[PDB]
């Protein structure tokens, strides 16, 4: 409980970093698709929201497998994050708002912040094994 | 959930490869006159859609179908060629060469961007696997 609570903030921030990078990679993949508004999330507000109320999913339901021969299958699943629209910079005839400079800057920034989260969490876990080890 | 980036970027790479292949096929047949069925070659183009099943927020990209490009067939007056029309109007494909070259360049650039995404994602997965160690 205590150890779970102490390591919960950085763990949740790192998970939200992963989901934000998935969203940014989806934006980069759809960069040439006509009629695709770029999506992004407000990291701080969603992080506090996940902090106060635990993580949740839109659906994520799945077929139950009582026997050992039942065929496993799961329907679509996604986080409970609010996918907001990014304000376009300049217009385009095809009708997508994926501006590549913004996408690649957010991608690199999210990359470094995820590495920072990994460093902090690893430092804390060593900072604990140091105490326990004897 | 960094594993889903593998699927997203792989789908994007496959779709951009298909688009580049279709553009190159159109470009290489700009001067064609005949098809396997005798019909004139019709310039073709892919259709890009969000690869998201119903209820999925954001996915990669997928090629729905390949469609004939909407443009008038280029009429050439050669009523000596064995293939001709009632008035000798040979029908040639409606390929716009500049458009195909720009499409090839764009597909190559998007492909390379997706490769960079995949590379940095794999590096991050390795670093995550080196979390506490």
């Amino acid at each position: 409980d205590r150890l779970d609570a102490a390591l919960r903030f950085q763990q949740e921030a790192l998970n939200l970093r992963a989901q934000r990078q998935e969203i940014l990679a989806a934006n980069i993949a759809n960069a040439d698709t006509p009629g695709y508004q770029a999506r992004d999330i407000d990291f701080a507000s969603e992080l506090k929201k996940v902090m106060v109320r635990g993580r949740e999913e839109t659906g994520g339901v799945a077929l139950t497998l009582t026997s050992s021969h039942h065929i496993p299958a799961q329907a679509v699943s996604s986080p409970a994050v609010d996918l907001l629209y990014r304000v376009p910079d300049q217009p385009s005839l095809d009708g997508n708002t994926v501006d590549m400079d913004r996408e690649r800057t957010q991608f690199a920034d999210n990359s470094l912040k995820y590495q920072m989260g990994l460093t902090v969490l690893g430092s804390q876990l060593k900072g604990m094994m140091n105490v326990l080890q004897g | 959930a960094l594993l889903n980036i593998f699927d997203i970027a792989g789908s994007a790479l496959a779709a951009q490869s298909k688009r580049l292949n279709v553009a190159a096929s159109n470009l290489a047949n700009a001067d064609s006159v005949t098809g396997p069925d005798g019909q004139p070659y019709r310039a073709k183009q892919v259709v890009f859609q969000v690869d998201a099943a119903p209820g999925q927020a954001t996915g990669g990209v997928k090629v729905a179908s390949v469609i004939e490009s909407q443009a008038p067939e280029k009429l050439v007056y050669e009523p000596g060629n064995p293939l001709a029309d009632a008035n000798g109007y040979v029908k040639m494909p409606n390929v716009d060469v500049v458009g195909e070259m720009v499409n090839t360049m764009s597909a190559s650039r998007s492909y390379q961007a997706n490769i960079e995404v995949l590379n940095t994602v794999k590096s991050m997965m390795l670093k995550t696997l080196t979390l506490g160690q």
Binding site: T33, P34 | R19, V46, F48
Partner: peptide, 16 residues
């Protein structure tokens, strides 16, 4: 609803 990427959807289309 997607559409054709690149040249076709970035050239001024006919009105109708």
């Amino acid at each position: 609803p997607g559409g054709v990427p690149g040249a076709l959807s970035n050239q001024p289309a006919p009105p109708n």
